[PDB]
Design an enzyme around this catalytic site. Structure first.
Site, short mmCIF file in Angstrom:
data_model
loop_
_atom_site.label_atom_id
_atom_site.label_comp_id
_atom_site.label_asym_id
_atom_site.label_seq_id
_atom_site.Cartn_x
_atom_site.Cartn_y
_atom_site.Cartn_z
CG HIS A 208 -41.82 31.64 7.56
ND1 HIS A 208 -42.24 32.85 7.04
CD2 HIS A 208 -42.92 31.09 8.14
CE1 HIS A 208 -43.54 33.00 7.24
NE2 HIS A 208 -43.97 31.95 7.91
CG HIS B 278 -24.08 27.55 14.61
ND1 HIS B 278 -24.57 26.73 15.60
CD2 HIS B 278 -22.86 27.05 14.28
CE1 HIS B 278 -23.69 25.78 15.86
NE2 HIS B 278 -22.64 25.95 15.06
CD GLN C 182 -24.78 23.59 12.50
OE1 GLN C 182 -24.11 24.57 12.86
NE2 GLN C 182 -24.30 22.64 11.68
CG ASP C 183 -27.07 26.32 18.24
OD1 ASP C 183 -26.40 25.64 17.44
OD2 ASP C 183 -27.13 26.06 19.45
NE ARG D 197 -43.19 31.81 12.06
CZ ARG D 197 -43.74 32.84 11.40
NH1 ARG D 197 -45.03 32.81 11.06
NH2 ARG D 197 -42.99 33.90 11.07
CD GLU E 265 -51.27 33.78 1.22
OE1 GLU E 265 -50.93 34.97 1.16
OE2 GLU E 265 -52.47 33.41 1.32
CG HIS F 154 -38.18 33.18 3.65
ND1 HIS F 154 -39.24 33.21 2.76
CD2 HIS F 154 -38.66 33.60 4.84
CE1 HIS F 154 -40.32 33.66 3.39
NE2 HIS F 154 -39.99 33.90 4.65
CG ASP G 121 -47.05 30.22 9.79
OD1 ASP G 121 -46.90 30.75 10.93
OD2 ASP G 121 -46.38 30.57 8.79
CD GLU G 122 -46.75 33.41 5.26
OE1 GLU G 122 -46.27 34.12 6.16
OE2 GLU G 122 -46.77 33.77 4.08
CG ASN H 143 -24.60 18.28 13.47
OD1 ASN H 143 -25.21 18.85 14.36
ND2 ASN H 143 -23.57 18.81 12.85
ZN LIG Z 1 -20.88 24.81 15.11
ZN LIG Z 2 -41.24 34.41 6.17
#
Ligand SMILES: [Zn+2]
Ligand SMILES: [Zn+2]
Ligand SMILES: [Fe+3]
Ligand SMILES: [Zn+2]
EC number: 4.2.1.1
Lengths: 205, 205, 205
Positions: free
Chosen positions: B73, B109, B67-68, B51, B76, B114, B53-54, B194
């Site tokens: 993110h 996973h 991965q899962d 994401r 700002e 960040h 968005d900042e 992968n």
């Molecule tokens: Zn795995």
């Molecule tokens: Zn964040």
């Protein structure tokens, strides 16, 4: 649908649907199930799961944010014999909840608050942090990867990154948030940003 | 749709849509939002959330995997006054990013990177690991449940499982990856697998 | 669809689809992919990801629960040359698995079991806990945020919250579950609740 009622079970004769303020933004890839109240200007991000299916409400106060992958759930608060399990209920201002999240609270990515639990206003729950069977005061900071289990965290304290607090003696001696502390202004910045994000995402729906 | 533009906000006058190489595979149950670049042969698994968005881009290099349940993110990078917040921007080869993930990187996973953060080529970020306000060098291994916060991890070092590194003095004394180290070949095996999975999943869409 | 076959790859000439008991409940926001067997009365919650695409089965026994955000995945068990990688396979009662989850097991929110791994009957894997390259005995409790990597956990032991166990010498000296231990009855309560939830959710589909 991603906003759903909880199911009929022995402790839940009547399904409840979430009560969501019209100014809240719930991402289509979040899940909100059951007896949940979500306040004004709340942002619920992708992959968050808020699930209230074991009795009594999960409350998320105004201008709070529930970030990606966050889980809110709670232990059973009513046994099959209709009797309330008092150990699994928190009381805030004369009302009972399974999980209470106050106003202006940030639940940062991948954190989890599991009832019974209360989180006071203006508190930052850091990335991957964990709160269970605890009351966290106002103006607190749980740094990333911290955890509070079975304790009361006094107002204005922080838990350093990675620390797992399981005893009241530990919790009583946590350091205080001061103006020079690295995370002292983090929550207010994050809340302001997320209130703006929620409004922007609302304009895309 | 699970691939979406970011919203209009005070720091983002114009929405951006993700730029995704045609050979990348994005699972229908992943979310990718905003100013994101995804390189060739990347696999993005179910429940991952990327994401942006900042402000400013999140870049995921060629032959990397997300991965899962992984979250990307960033803080700002442009305040409401249009001014870039330099503390929240990383620079890699003369370009600015909110999060930079290099080539042949595995984000295993439930890990999270960040921004501001950079992860160098051929690095394994282990299951449930956390990277924030850090630069991780090339050929590094973060074992499961490790974390790097506010530090630079030199090339070719590993962080043992569960260790949370928050000081540069600690990071400077991390052990080196050698051929007999248990995770010395893990990333190359995982990347090869992968890249093949991404091609196989592409053949089902 | 959220229940899907795995893809064709060099180690997987023929796709497999999940085998799911008709009394199991799989949330529409969970993902189940590939060679997976799910037993009777299992509850799979929102945002869980069970992904069996690197060879050999992931098995989830009767009356177990896989809670929100849980990930099950496994290392490659068959190389490109068709040869089984014995290090990455667990054996339970004369059969081979990539991940084996026994009966009446609770995988609590945001936990992860990554193959090769086995989890014995009536074991609670706590919130955010991690199991990898390990065999966990029956009647065990992994408290929240604990981890077992590369070890065998004997029957009837618990790992205290936040502890990361990486050596067999450590695992051999874990404390025993006794009747006065705080989590001694947790798993049976959680299993009973989730068996009822699965039935209630089934009545909404
Ligand atoms: Zn795995
Ligand atoms: Zn964040
Ligand atoms: Fe999802
Ligand atoms: Zn729960």
């Amino acid at each position: 649908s991603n906003i759903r009622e909880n199911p009929v079970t022995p402790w839940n004769p009547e399904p409840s649907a979430p009560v969501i303020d019209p100014t809240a933004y719930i991402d289509p890839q979040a899940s909100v199930i059951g007896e949940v109240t979500i306040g004004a200007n709340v942002m619920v991000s992708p992959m968050a799961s808020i699930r209230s299916d074991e009795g009594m409400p999960i409350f998320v106060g105004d201008r709070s944010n529930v970030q990606d992958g966050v889980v809110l759930h709670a232990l059973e608060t009513i046994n099959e014999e209709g009797e309330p399990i008092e150990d699994n209920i928190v009381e805030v201002d004369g009302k009972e909840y399974a999980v209470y999240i106050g106003n202006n609270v940030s639940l940062a990515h991948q954190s989890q608050v599991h009832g019974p639990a209360a989180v006071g206003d203006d508190t930052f729950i850091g990335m991957q942090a964990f709160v269970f069977k605890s009351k966290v005061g106002n103006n607190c900071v749980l740094e990333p990867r911290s955890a509070a289990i079975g304790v009361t965290i006094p107002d204005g304290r922080y838990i350093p990154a990675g620390m797992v607090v399981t005893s009241q003696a530990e919790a009583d001696k946590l350091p205080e948030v001061t103006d020079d502390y690295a995370y002292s202004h983090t929550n207010e910045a994050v809340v302001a940003v997320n209130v703006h994000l929620a409004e922007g995402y609302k304009e895309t729906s």
